[PDB]
Design a protein around this ligand. Structure first.
Ligand SMILES: [Mn+2]
Ligand SMILES: [Mn+2]
Lengths: 200, 198
């Protein structure tokens, strides 16, 4: 019952910051595999009528024998679903969260530096996040497909630092990928996620 | 200080099983970074004079202020040092450990099936291993740069399943990379590691 969402732009739309080949394989193979395996895990359980956000927020209540499959593949589905919507060929560094970041870090650039440092320091596979914890902004990273929702922090920006997300264009140069990412951040979607969670 | 060992072959030697671009970056960037960071962690400490095998076996006793850096970068140095010597352009599927595999699994094919299954199922970054555990052969996987020595098991074959090890040639197709690996396994090195197992 979970479905692979179409990208909200073309595979080529994020060039030259993220290559078309990566956008295609990352979406049509990696994300698709998470959807297939999530559906196999939840099929015939009462997870199958729940939102992915409810499942990932409540992984501790997922039946023991499927909890790892749901953590990994449910996490994969939520994280990539967020990621596609958080990218745009028309990125503008403005809006409510940019203003909150400038207030807290003193500048957007100082925030980008801390986010880049944490994203680079995430050893192995995982994600770098800006989260809202009970109205407050924090940078965190997670391993594999873990999502801050599970820890009661609402993600409003995420960067995939699995090597599949950057290896074809950047190989070992994760810092260059992180630098490229700023050019395609959908700050409108960041604002939408923040606004939804500041009053929830 | 720890040093980056040269490969025993050129970057093209494992073509067309593993691509030259990967061998170059994997060795001269990824492994090199582990050595740099390991040396920074152990420099001027009681660890500096210890073998990387003794250090990784005994991570439990590494001071907390450097334990993560030694785990990740010490593991990275040991794991890649093993990996380069366990690959060859002149693979021959025979010897002491092939015979011992058949005594456990019944066939090399049955061993390869279990190895491929565990290697494919390792979620995120890590390694698939054949180990000696109190004289018995077992397949295990580890996350990130963790190594079976830390659990008192002796690694005798390892496959890197970090995406950097296979993405340029195989992209998402980790199973095709695992299949290609068999063509370049150095079973003489496997035998050497087995014969030395403590
Ligand atoms: Mn991904
Ligand atoms: Mn590696």
């Amino acid at each position: 019952a979970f479905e692979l969402p179409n990208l909200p732009y073309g595979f080529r739309a994020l060039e030259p910051h993220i290559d078309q080949q990566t956008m295609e394989i990352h979406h049509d193979k990696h994300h698709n595999t998470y959807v297939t395996r999530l559906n196999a895990a939840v099929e015939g359980t009462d997870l199958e009528s729940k939102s992915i956000e409810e499942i990932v927020a409540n992984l501790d209540s997922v039946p023991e024998n499927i909890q790892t499959a749901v953590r990994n593949n449910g996490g994969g589905h939520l994280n990539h679903s967020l990621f596609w919507e958080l990218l745009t060929p028309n990125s503008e560094e403005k809006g409510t969260v940019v203003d909150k970041i400038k207030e807290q870090w003193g500048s957007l650039d100082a925030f980008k530096e801390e986010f880049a440092n944490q994203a680079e320091a995430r050893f192995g596979s995982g994600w770098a996040w800006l989260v809202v914890n009970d109205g407050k902004l924090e940078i965190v990273t997670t391993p594999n497909q873990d999502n801050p929702l599970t820890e009661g922090k609402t993600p409003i920006l995420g960067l995939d630092v699995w090597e599949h997300a950057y290896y074809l264009k950047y190989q070992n140069k994760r810092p260059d990928y992180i630098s490229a990412f700023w050019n395609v951040v959908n700050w409108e979607k960041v604002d939408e996620l923040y606004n939804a969670a500041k009053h929830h």
